[PDB]
């Protein structure tokens, strides 16, 4: 009997968060998923589930759970949803059209922005084609934007594919950093490893 609580603290309150292009996965398994800690939060900017009601999370069993987390701008959080397009959905982190899981975000201006600007968080600006759902690209190959081949040297129509967010505490809300957690729920032909308390 799985009896130890799923370590949601280690996900939501991780001391470090990934750049979106290099998004972090934690596997959650062989644990009781108590969501009441998340239910009692007022500061999340969004908390939506797809394929299950948020009201039923404490009653459901899954074969596998993944927690994907990263930082993006406020007005890019709408892209972390099935059927979205934009730099983030297309080139950084793509959810499937039939996604089963929840997307939670919160403003992290107090932690992730600095007086000089925080340039540590990166996003992929260019890619030859869109990510498949749950695909991850950490390559730093020079992007050929034009006719001429680039020979892995930067210049005219030959761009380094990653760009920095540069988060300043004085940015408008849409340009402030937001932390995101995506909980993926799998229901495969396998034993359940994650259940709610009930």
């Amino acid at each position: 009997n799985i009896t130890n609580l799923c370590p949601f603290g280690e996900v939501f309150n991780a001391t470090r968060f990934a750049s979106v292009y290099a998004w972090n996965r934690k596997r959650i398994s062989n644990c009781v998923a108590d969501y009441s800690v998340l239910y009692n939060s007022a500061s999340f900017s969004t908390f939506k589930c797809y394929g299950v009601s948020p009201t039923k999370l404490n009653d459901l069993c899954f074969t596998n759970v993944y927690a994907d987390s990263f930082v993006i701008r406020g007005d890019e959080v709408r892209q972390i949803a099935p059927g979205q397009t934009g730099k983030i959905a297309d080139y950084n982190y793509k959810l499937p059209d039939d996604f089963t899981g929840c997307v939670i975000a919160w403003n992290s201006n107090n932690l992730d922005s600095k007086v000089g600007g925080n340039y540590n968080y990166l996003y992929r600006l260019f890619r030859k084609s869109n990510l498949k759902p749950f695909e991850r690209d950490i390559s730093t190959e020079i992007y050929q934007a034009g006719s001429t081949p680039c020979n892995g040297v930067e210049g005219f129509n030959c761009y380094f594919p990653l760009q920095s967010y540069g988060f300043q505490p004085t940015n408008g809300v849409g340009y402030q950093p937001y932390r995101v957690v995506v909980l993926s729920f799998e229901l495969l032909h396998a034993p359940a490893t994650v259940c709610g308390p009930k």
Partner: nanobody
Amino acid sequence: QVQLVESGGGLVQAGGSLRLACIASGRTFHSYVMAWFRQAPGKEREFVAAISWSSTPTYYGESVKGRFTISRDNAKNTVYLQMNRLKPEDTAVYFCAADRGESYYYTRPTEYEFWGQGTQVTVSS
């Protein structure tokens, strides 16, 4: 892009009934949580009701609980709001809304991507 058009609004006497309807574009209506909000003059958009994909969690604002019923007909891309025992305080613009996601914070306007232009309901006393 999903478009939404409300109908069935207008003038009605206190204690009367109205069925608002809202029809959506698109071939994946079943994938949308559908909702009703309303806005009285001087007030912000107030949550009225929402219905999940299966119909099976429904949600209601405190002041309409018992009087209003939300329902959906996936075959017709339509969500309905049955409004019974209407009071003057129910007078407002009623907005249809839709989102792929069901929100823990289901009363927040920002949790719904798609909005109709709204239709006036007026309840005389």
